[PDB]
Amino acid sequence: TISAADIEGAIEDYVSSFEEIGTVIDAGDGIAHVEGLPSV
Amino acid sequence: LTNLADELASVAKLLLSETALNKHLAEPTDDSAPKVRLLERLLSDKVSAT
């Protein structure tokens, strides 16, 4: 099941699939952590 | 069934060895279509239909 670097050619097509919008992952004490927003 | 088990074990070791692909493939997401497309582009022909 040897696989070459073709995964990079596919995974890149998968990350590029996703107006940036993030998701709150945790919150407390006036601090909130947001996933996503790569360009913030 | 033996072929299915062998293929699944091979895929499991592939994911273990290739950490980044498994990481990308594991993030929960509302729509799985990108993940399915990623699998098909990766190993549509390498493994059997089942």
From Swiss-Prot, chain A:
Segments forming a coiled coil: none
Cysteine pairings via disulfide bonds: none
Compartment(s) where it occurs, according to its Swiss-Prot or TrEMBL record: Cell membrane
Family (UniProt): Belongs to the ATPase alpha/beta chains family.
The protein's role, per its UniProt record: Produces ATP from ADP in the presence of a proton gradient across the membrane. The alpha chain is a regulatory subunit.
Subunit structure as annotated in this protein's UniProt entry: F-type ATPases have 2 components, CF(1) - the catalytic core - and CF(0) - the membrane proton channel. CF(1) has five subunits: alpha(3), beta(3), gamma(1), delta(1), epsilon(1). CF(0) has three main subunits: a(1), b(2) and c(9-12). The alpha and beta chains form an alternating ring which encloses part of the gamma chain. CF(1) is attached to CF(0) by a central stalk formed by the gamma and epsilon chains, while a peripheral stalk is formed by the delta and b chains.
Name of the protein in question: ATP synthase subunit alpha
Organism listed in the record: Mycolicibacterium smegmatis (strain ATCC 700084 / mc(2)155)
Curated annotation (Swiss-Prot), chain B:
Domain of life: Bacteria
Protein location: Cell membrane
Functional summary from the UniProt entry: F(1)F(0) ATP synthase produces ATP from ADP in the presence of a proton or sodium gradient. F-type ATPases consist of two structural domains, F(1) containing the extramembraneous catalytic core and F(0) containing the membrane proton channel, linked together by a central stalk and a peripheral stalk. During catalysis, ATP synthesis in the catalytic domain of F(1) is coupled via a rotary mechanism of the central stalk subunits to proton translocation. This fusion protein includes a component of the F(0) channel (subunit b) and of the F(1) subunit (subunit delta). Two copies of subunit b and one of delta together form the peripheral 'stator' stalk which links F(1) to F(0).
Note: Binds 2-aminothiazole antibiotics, which are antitubercular agents.
Subunit structure: F-type ATPases have 2 components, F(1) - the catalytic core - and F(0) - the membrane proton channel. F(1) has five subunits: alpha(3), beta(3), gamma(1), delta(1), epsilon(1). F(0) has three main subunits: a(1), b(2) and c(10-14). The alpha and beta chains form an alternating ring which encloses part of the gamma chain. F(1) is attached to F(0) by a central stalk formed by the gamma and epsilon chains, while a peripheral stalk is formed by the delta and b chains.
Similarity comment: In the N-terminal section; belongs to the ATPase B chain family.
Identification of the protein by name: ATP synthase subunit b-delta
Species of the source: Mycolicibacterium smegmatis (strain ATCC 700084 / mc(2)155)
This protein's encoding gene: atpFH
Residues of the full protein shown: 199 to 248 of 445
